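Reviewers of the previous submission asked for a worked example of the structure-prediction workflow described in the proposal, so we include one complete record here. The input consisted solely of the amino acid sequence. No template or homolog information was supplied to the procedure at any stage.
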Amino acid sequence: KKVVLGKKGDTVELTCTASQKKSIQFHWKNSNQIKILGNQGSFLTKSPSKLNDRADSRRSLWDQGNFPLIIKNLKIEDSDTYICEVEDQKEEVQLLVFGLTANSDTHLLQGQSLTLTLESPPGSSPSVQCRSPRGKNIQGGKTLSVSQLELQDSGTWTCTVLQNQKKVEFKIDIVVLA
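From that input alone, the workflow returned the following structure tokens.
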């Protein structure tokens, strides 16, 4: 079904919009029928999930038939296919959380090599396309490198992973010491 990409450490909001008469009974569950949250009358209730203290919704939206599932401080283990059920209507949203890190000092000496590491959820195979501060571009799957670093390559870069038509931007400031 629908796929949503989120960033490690960020917040993502998965959507759930009804159709039938406005606002009713609802709940979100992960792949294996483990309730994450839902309503108790006019209120929210969080089940004791592995995400409780980072899972939430937006009560005001419920009246407009919208029951979102917001997860903060995302871990890549949060990738799963989540399920929203409103009355009888059911919906699925696969969340793929990615990370794009750099162990290469971040402040490098000219002629050095930087290496970026895309951290993906199990099974995930995407693609990373970093545009340097000067239009040059690299590409990879889990790692990308530029082994001949210029000073003028200092600044922000734009790495963008892809998975299922959707994509996320990942900006990093590369500092080049002369």
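The chain has two domains: 1-98, 99-173. We consider this example representative of the routine output the project will generate in years two and three.
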